[PDB]
Amino acid sequence: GIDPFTFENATSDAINQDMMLYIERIAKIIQKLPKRVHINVRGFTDDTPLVKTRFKSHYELAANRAYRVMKVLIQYGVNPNQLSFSSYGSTNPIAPNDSLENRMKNNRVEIFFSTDANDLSKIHSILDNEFNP
C-alpha cells in the first residue's frame, strides 16, 4: 500500500538519496492534510547485535532513525507542531528475524496518522492520489 522507510543495513541510521526522495513525497502529502491531523514517526530495528557500533541499545538506534526522518520532514516544510517521534526498539517486528532480507524489513520507520473520523477520508484520498499512476 505504502512502504515504510527501510534502512540500508541493520546498524545504520543513515538516510540515503532514495530515502530522502521518499521522505519528500511524504512531507508533500502531510502538508495537504487537515491541520488537526498529527504525525508520529515510529522507529524500529531487527535483532542484530549492536557490537561494532556506537549504540548501546536498539531503542537508541530506533530513536535516532525516527528522529532523523522527522528532521528531514521538518526540512521539507512540515510543521513541528504536527510531529513527534517514537522508538520501539527491536520490539513489534514486521517480519521474522530469520534471514538477512526479513531482518531488513524490521529496520524501518513507520508513519502513524492521528485523525478524527471526518479527516480520515481526506488523508485516504490524498494518499491514493500520490501513490498511484
Add this chain to the structure above:
Amino acid sequence: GIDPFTFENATSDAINQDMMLYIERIAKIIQKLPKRVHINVRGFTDDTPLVKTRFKSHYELAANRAYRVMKVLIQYGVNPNQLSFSSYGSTNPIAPNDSLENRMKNNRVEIFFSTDANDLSKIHSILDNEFNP
C-alpha cells in the same frame, strides 16, 4: 531553582549564545541521570499577536522553540530515545501578560522529567550537586 530557556523576543525561536551555553549545561546534566528518566521539552509563548511573522499560531511558535531546544540537547550528547517536545502555545503562562518583562517570562521552554519515585531522589541530588554546590 533551575531557570527555563528564555527567548529574546516575543516572536522568535532564536536561541542566544548565553542560553545555548545553558542548554549545554542541561544536556550535560541529562546524560548523568538514570537511563529510565525521560525528558519532555515544552514550548510556551506570551500572548502578543503574531503580526509580521511566519508563524500562524502560538502553538507553532512554541513548537518550533521546543523542537529547537530538543535538537541542541541532542547536539550536545542527549540520547534521542530519552527526548520528546511539546507545544502549549500561549496557554499556561507563568506570569501575567501585562508588561513587556512579564511577557518575556512567558516566552520560554521548560524541561519536564518523567521519573519513578526512586529515580526522583537521584535527579534531586544531581541538580543540587550541580546548581548549588
